Design a protein around this nucleic acid. Structure first.
Ligand code: NA
Ligand code: NA
Length: 209
DNA sequence: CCATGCGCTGAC
DNA sequence: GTCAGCGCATGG
């Protein structure tokens, strides 16, 4: 797959799991190994990860409200920090807004024919609330295609403006956290994937003090 | 070129 | 738990 492919990655079913983000990147399902969103600001967003990293994220499984990135001071060669400035409808935030089936709008937009929007591959990471109903117990899990129904700017918990996006699921395969999804995962033999040599290295490191 | 970054690791 | 700061891919 080209980097700008929209839609599912062939041969990677819903429910596939990987221990580390770099493995998710290698699969093609989410090519950035740090960033939450993969997008091109004049094309759209191809995928996103829910990893508990923004306090304004709210995950309801078949739908969720995702937060834009940025509004943060990453001075000192940081990757994450708390909010310290307003977010902007630029870069990955603009990309994800362009998936919505409505022209880009600096005040937000909502699509009526929201399935006509561009698909987003969604991965859930283990981090987030304790004993989440949706997050995997370990690693990262591909949960299928979702679509951006609407997006809008709002005052975040921090008091700074954040961009927010409502995504709804649009995938024919069962959600992995449901009974049907757990049955499909069992039948397909989907299990956590680890880097070559990792479990051996772990086994060696566990031999002594 | 330079900016961005929902990770990761392990010393403390 | 807290924390600091690293390579790297990606793209503006
Ligand atoms: Na990245
Ligand atoms: Na980029």
């Amino acid at each position: 797959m080209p980097a700008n492919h929209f839609g599912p990655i062939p041969g990677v079913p819903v429910g596939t799991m990987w221990r580390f983000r770099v493995q998710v990147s290698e699969s093609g399902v989410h090519r950035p190994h740090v960033a939450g969103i993969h997008g091109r600001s004049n094309d759209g967003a191809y995928s996103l990860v829910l990893a508990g990293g923004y306090e304004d994220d709210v995950d309801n499984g078949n739908y969720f409200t995702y937060t834009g990135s940025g509004g943060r001071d990453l001075s000192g060669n940081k990757r994450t920090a708390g909010q310290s400035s307003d977010q902007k409808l630029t870069n990955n935030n603009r990309a994800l807004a362009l998936n919505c089936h409505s022209p880009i709008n600096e005040k937000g937009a909502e699509a009526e024919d929201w399935r006509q929007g561009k698909p987003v591959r969604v991965v859930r990471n283990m981090k987030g609330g304790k004993h989440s109903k949706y997050a995997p117990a370990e690693g990262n899990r591909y949960d299928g295609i979702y679509k951006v129904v609407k997006y809008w700017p709002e005052r975040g918990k921090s008091g700074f403006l954040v961009w927010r996006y409502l995504l709804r699921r649009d995938d024919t395969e069962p959600e992995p956290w449901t009974r049907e999804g757990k049955d499909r995962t069992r039948q397909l033999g989907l299990t956590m994937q680890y880097p070559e040599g990792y479990l051996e290295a772990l086994a060696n490191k566990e031999k002594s003090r």
